[PDB]
């Protein structure tokens, strides 16, 4: 899918091309003239040198035609440095196109990926372009370099090189750095292989690995830089050292479309000792630094992971998390490590995407608008159409909840684990109904039969389960709802939640009535809607 | 400061009624050689030349038509640091 | 057309290409198998450790230090594979260099010495440099991985370790494969030589302008624009270079090679003891490349030259280089002259139809060529066999004439170049023929047919024509004319002399040719294309 | 020439009738860190095991049946200058 944006782009790419490619063959002209004049000089200087040993070898007209091809050459001297540096504001105009859009948004859509939703595009698009600015900045650094050459043969007191020259060296080595440095990108971010879902959080003495790419594909730099990978590197905080297998020699053979890659698999984290911000706030950067020599050019380069939370047990990965969410949904800022200080707030409606990214991301179905709806409750208090209202990271987490002992993202966190690792089926075909008003839950059973029944969450534990609720019917008329003690991690480890549901019974008079559980919310018996997962 | 033309001065020394001697400074910068040209001023007549070596700093011109105004023009070729090509001298004389 | 030789060549270089594939997924699995040996250990060491701060002596286990123990091992016998895999990649690799080096590559060098003397042009140095290009990226793979394998020794070693005692001469042997293959590539692919005289390279006047132009056959875009290439002559009678005298290799060509060409270069002797149209000299080629830390020194040359004062002198200079080129293939021999070796007519026979078909549309015919022989060797038929002295082809006079051989057939070919040239192509002109057969063969035909030939009594080369007038006795008698020159053809084409050309025999001026050409042919016909007004 | 074992020379110097001190001399090489087994010798009974760190030259063994045969062997990881795992060392101790 390409924007008009890009094929302008794609463009302008050829345009500089062709460009370059019509200034090399200016220069095979320019060379042409001054070998013409140096060598016809030469010879009519050692001729009008060697036979005064005969002083009419040598005509005025034949120095009158030098000096005059003398200045034809310092007239096309003085066009191509123009033109050159008419190539050059061109390049500079490309590239900030290429750095601070096109690759601002790749920088992005990674960012939002790593949260959830919207896998991004891959590099490959992205690289050939860079690419494609990259060879013809090379080839104009080689015919800046010519022109160097061309100075030391023949030159005068005018000389458009001597004087312009060294700008536009200047120019094409910034822009060539630069470009390079730009192309250095963490490609896959930090991650620990057994969370997945996780990136960006880094438990010490687990394995995690990363993966960087450098979107220049020459071949003259295969095998040629060796990147070490680091942490923290350079406040009032805590700090880590890296341990493993750290430096690795960037091939081109482990990517399929031959691009210039380097994987870190065996890196884990060990914390360091010495003398602000929770653990699960306080930020780090995994930094990656190589150096290229490239036809005589130095080139530092250096990039960084994303921030990473970096944590000592595996209870901390719902505050850690919530910390990275809250990071990536707001700043698009890559070094932000004092982001919890003062930390932004966020709309609802970016958040509600957030929220049914971590249940798309995870499992076949997101969250709807009702499910939603009864979230932004639990967040702001009571209303309807919460569309502008705003939200503090000390609402998110951090701070409990509607006087209950927890925060909201950390009830949720482990209600999507016991999604993941239970129940995952049932949640899948929209047999949970998960998020539900008790008013609601009313509203919604009363119209329908007494035996009828839902599956929601329970609201009383930070650990998450899940629990049922029917209608019982009483003389007035009215319905009335039960809802059972919910059912944990450590219930379902020993029977399934759908086992336990066509199972269960519960006491009428003095006998164990028989399922009080007969039909799924929308009037669907019992037996068709979780006989499949029984015995 | 300064001067531009290739040599500062030039002169005429010596003379005949048929010939001429010309000095001129010996030059700052390092010529490798020059040219000499002499015309009769008003003549469409053409022009002679000759060349003499960065070494010398005269040349002797001869076979002038006596009483006749001369046009006398002394041009360098400078090579040694960077080409130069400096602007010539001419003096006008009647032997 | 392709050799045997050569598919089988082609064969061996992508046999060699998909080996050190193999091999570059072989470092792949045995880097991955030491980077899980030593994040284990450090791993199991740094939890053996911390946790011995708290107390405990009883977290890692003997049973994952035995495993420990045995993937070392593991990889130690797969390093040892891996580097006797790669020794015997280097040996496959040496062999298929020989066979680029010493001998296709040695069979252009000389079907270019043939060209330049003449022959056939082969020349087209393309599917050379492709061969040449696949060997070397070949070889730079296999560079990376000897590199990587000094990688993998800092990061993990041991005392026996494969690597620490064999891939030191991994390394030697691939860096004098790779730098002899480029020092092998670097070839004078036009010679030297002036534009002026296209059809005499190898021999230089002083000051006049020649061109040269240098190939490296190893097509790597990471050289373009990277070498500079300094000429020069005579590196340690002697000259010097002037012009310009560097230049720097590009790939703007033809097919995108990487070449550099040299206009702008001639000859100046500075301030002795062989005769000058036999001393012979080199001119030098010479780069540096720096490729991926290898420093690679290139030095190639010419072929001899022969470096001349004056134009009269270039017969004799171009018979030296004819002498030289025909007869050996060694590219350096400024001493040939010295003792000069000696050449079969077989040979010489096939060098001189050469200097015709090079120049001309035609070549020499064997009564052309056997009446050759007469003037080198003696009287005689089928010389085959026959050897032939240098001294006897050009140092020497011949036949009690004042001139040499060669000389005198320079001059004549001169002649035929730049006039009566329309009337060589097409075959008017019999030009080298017996007296006898000259005889023998207008006899047959009637009084007036006539016969064009070349002059033997000038070293300047000249043409004459020759009749048969018949006599009383019944016998035929020959008449030949003095023979036209180069200074009377300026004045009149050698076509327009035949056609007015007349004799006085008694009183009037009859037109003695003006008939017919050898075989039959009115006069007209045959020249009257040139009479023009 | 040298003695090629883990640690080279082992004894235990006190003893109670249910546990054993262990010194070897000080290694040469950089010791990480050394396992210690013991079992009963030729038992199927499994062997039990514990580590020191490299820093140590003696460790402390319990819970030992009195007059048994036990097996104790010594072994060591260096990694400092190369990885080197040498063979371990072994004694027969009877309490």
Same mark, same amino acid.
């Given at each position: 899918?390409?924007?008009?944006?890009?094929?302008?782009?794609?463009?302008?790419?050829?345009?500089?091309?062709?460009?370059?490619?019509?200034?090399?063959?200016?220069?095979?002209?320019?060379?042409?003239?001054?070998?013409?004049?140096?060598?016809?000089?030469?010879?009519?200087?050692?001729?009008?040198?060697?036979?005064?040993?005969?002083?009419?070898? /040598?005509?005025?007209?034949?120095?009158?035609?030098?000096?005059?091809?003398?200045?034809?050459?310092?007239?096309?001297?003085?066009?191509?440095?123009?033109?050159?540096?008419?190539?050059?504001?061109?390049?500079?105009?490309?590239?900030?196109?290429?750095?601070?859009?096109?690759?601002?948004?790749?920088?992005?859509?990674?960012?939002?990926?790593?949260? %959830?939703?919207?896998?991004?595009?891959?590099?490959?698009?992205?690289?050939?372009?860079?690419?494609?600015?990259?060879?013809? +900045?090379?080839?104009?650094?080689?015919?800046?370099?010519?022109?160097?050459?061309? +100075?030391?043969?023949?030159?005068?007191?005018?000389?458009?090189?001597?004087?312009?020259?060294?700008?536009?060296?200047?120019?094409?080595?910034?822009?060539?750095?630069?470009?390079?440095?730009?192309?250095?990108?963490?490609?896959?971010?930090?991650?620990?292989?057994?969370? #997945?879902?996780?990136?960006?959080?880094?438990?010490?003495?687990?394995?995690?690995?990363?993966?960087?790419?450098?979107? &220049?594909?020459?071949?003259?730099?295969?095998?040629?830089?060796?990147?070490?990978?680091?942490?923290?590197?350079?406040?009032?905080?805590?700090?880590?050292?890296?341990? %493993?297998?750290?430096?690795?020699?960037?091939?081109?053979?482990?990517?399929?479309?031959?691009?210039?890659?380097?994987?870190?698999?065996?890196?884990?984290?060990?914390?360091?000792?010495?003398?602000?911000?929770?653990?699960?706030?306080?930020?780090?950067?995994? *930094?990656?630094?190589?150096?290229?020599?490239?036809?005589?050019?130095?080139?530092?380069?250096?990039?960084?992971?994303? #921030?990473?939370?970096?944590?000592?047990?595996?209870?901390?990965?719902?505050?850690?998390?919530?910390?990275?969410?809250?990071?990536?949904?707001?700043?698009?800022? #890559?070094?932000? /490590?004092?982001?919890?200080?003062?930390?932004?707030?966020?709309?609802?409606?970016?958040?509600?995407?957030?929220?049914?990214?971590?249940?798309?991301?995870?499992?076949?179905?997101?969250?709807?608008?009702?499910?939603?709806?009864?979230?932004?409750?639990?967040?702001? %208090?009571?209303?309807?159409?919460?569309?502008?209202?705003?939200?503090?990271?000390?609402?998110?987490?951090?701070?409990?909840?509607?006087?209950?002992?927890?925060?909201?993202?950390?009830?949720?966190?482990?209600?999507?684990?016991? &999604?993941?690792?239970?129940?995952?089926?049932?949640?899948?075909?929209?047999?949970?109904?998960?998020?539900?008003?008790?008013?609601?839950?009313?509203?919604?059973?009363? $119209?329908?039969?007494?035996?009828?029944?839902?599956?929601?969450?329970?609201?009383?534990?930070?650990?998450?389960?899940?629990?049922? *609720?029917? &209608?019982?019917?009483?003389?007035?008329?009215?319905?009335?709802?039960?809802?059972?003690? #919910?059912?944990?991690?450590?219930?379902?480890?020993?029977?399934?939640?759908?086992?336990?549901?066509? %199972?269960?019974?519960?006491?009428?008079?003095?006998?164990?009535?028989?399922?009080?559980?007969?039909?799924?919310?929308?009037?669907?018996?019992?037996?068709?809607?979780?006989?499949?997962?029984?015995? | 400061?300064?001067?531009?033309? &290739?040599? *500062?001065?030039?002169?005429?020394?010596?003379?005949?009624?048929?010939?001429?001697?010309?000095?001129?400074?010996?030059?700052?910068?390092?010529?490798?050689?020059?040219?000499?040209?002499?015309?009769?001023?008003?003549?469409?007549?053409? /022009?002679?030349?000759?060349?003499?070596?960065?070494?010398?700093?005269?040349?002797?011109?001869?076979?002038?038509?006596?009483?006749?105004?001369? $046009?006398?023009?002394?041009?360098?070729?400078?090579?040694?640091?960077?080409?130069?090509?400096?602007?010539?001298?001419?003096?006008?004389?009647? *032997?």
């Amino acid at each position: 899918v390409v924007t008009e944006k890009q094929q302008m782009l794609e463009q302008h790419l050829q345009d500089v091309r062709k460009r370059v490619q019509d200034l090399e063959q200016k220069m095979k002209v320019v060379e042409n003239l001054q070998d013409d004049f140096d060598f016809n000089y030469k010879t009519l200087k050692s001729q009008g040198d060697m036979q005064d040993l005969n002083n009419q070898s /040598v005509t005025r007209q034949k120095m009158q035609q030098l000096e005059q091809m003398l200045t034809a050459l310092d007239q096309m001297r003085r066009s191509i440095v123009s033109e050159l540096a008419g190539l050059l504001s061109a390049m500079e105009y490309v590239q900030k196109t290429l750095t601070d859009e096109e690759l601002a948004d790749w920088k992005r859509r990674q960012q939002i990926a790593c949260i %959830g939703g919207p896998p991004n595009i891959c590099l490959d698009r992205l690289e050939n372009w860079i690419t494609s600015l990259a060879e013809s +900045q090379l080839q104009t650094r080689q015919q800046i370099k010519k022109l160097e050459e061309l +100075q030391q043969k023949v030159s005068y007191k005018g000389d458009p090189i001597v004087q312009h020259r060294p700008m536009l060296e200047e120019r094409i080595v910034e822009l060539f750095r630069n470009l390079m440095k730009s192309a250095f990108v963490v490609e896959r971010q930090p991650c620990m292989p057994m969370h #997945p879902d996780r990136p960006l959080v880094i438990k010490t003495g687990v394995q995690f690995t990363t993966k960087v790419r450098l979107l &220049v594909k020459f071949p003259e730099l295969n095998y040629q830089l060796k990147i070490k990978v680091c942490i923290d590197k350079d406040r009032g905080s805590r700090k880590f050292n890296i341990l %493993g297998t750290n430096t690795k020699v960037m091939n081109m053979e482990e990517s399929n479309n031959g691009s210039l890659s380097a994987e870190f698999k065996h890196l884990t984290l060990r914390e360091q000792r010495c003398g602000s911000l929770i653990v699960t706030e306080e930020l780090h950067l995994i *930094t990656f630094e190589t150096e290229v020599y490239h036809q005589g050019l130095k080139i530092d380069l250096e990039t960084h992971s994303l #921030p990473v939370v970096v944590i000592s047990n595996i209870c901390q990965m719902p505050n850690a998390w919530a910390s990275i969410l809250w990071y990536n949904m707001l700043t698009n800022n #890559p070094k932000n /490590v004092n982001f919890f200080t003062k930390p932004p707030i966020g709309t609802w409606d970016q958040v509600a995407e957030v929220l049914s990214w971590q249940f798309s991301s995870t499992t076949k179905r997101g969250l709807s608008i009702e499910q939603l709806t009864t979230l932004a409750e639990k967040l702001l %208090g009571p209303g309807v159409n919460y569309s502008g209202c705003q939200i503090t990271w000390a609402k998110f987490c951090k701070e409990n909840m509607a006087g209950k002992g927890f925060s909201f993202w950390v009830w949720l966190d482990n209600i999507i684990d016991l &999604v993941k690792k239970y129940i995952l089926a049932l949640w899948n075909e929209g047999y949970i109904m998960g998020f539900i008003s008790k008013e609601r839950e009313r509203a919604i059973l009363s $119209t329908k039969p007494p035996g009828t029944f839902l599956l929601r969450f329970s609201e009383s534990s930070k650990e998450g389960g899940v629990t049922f *609720t029917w &209608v019982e019917k009483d003389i007035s008329g009215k319905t009335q709802i039960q809802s059972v003690e #919910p059912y944990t991690k450590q219930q379902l480890n020993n029977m399934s939640f759908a086992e336990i549901i066509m %199972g269960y019974k519960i006491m009428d008079a003095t006998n164990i009535l028989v399922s009080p559980l007969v039909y799924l919310y929308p009037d669907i018996p019992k037996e068709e809607a979780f006989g499949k997962y029984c015995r | 400061g300064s001067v531009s033309s &290739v040599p *500062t001065k030039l002169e005429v020394v010596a003379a005949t009624p048929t010939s001429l001697l010309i000095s001129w400074d010996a030059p700052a910068v390092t010529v490798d050689f020059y040219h000499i040209t002499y015309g009769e001023t008003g003549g469409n007549s053409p /022009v002679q030349e000759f060349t003499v070596p960065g070494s010398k700093s005269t040349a002797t011109i001869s076979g002038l038509k006596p009483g006749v105004d001369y $046009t006398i023009t002394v041009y360098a070729y400078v090579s040694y640091p960077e080409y130069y090509f400096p602007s010539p001298i001419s003096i006008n004389y009647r *032997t």
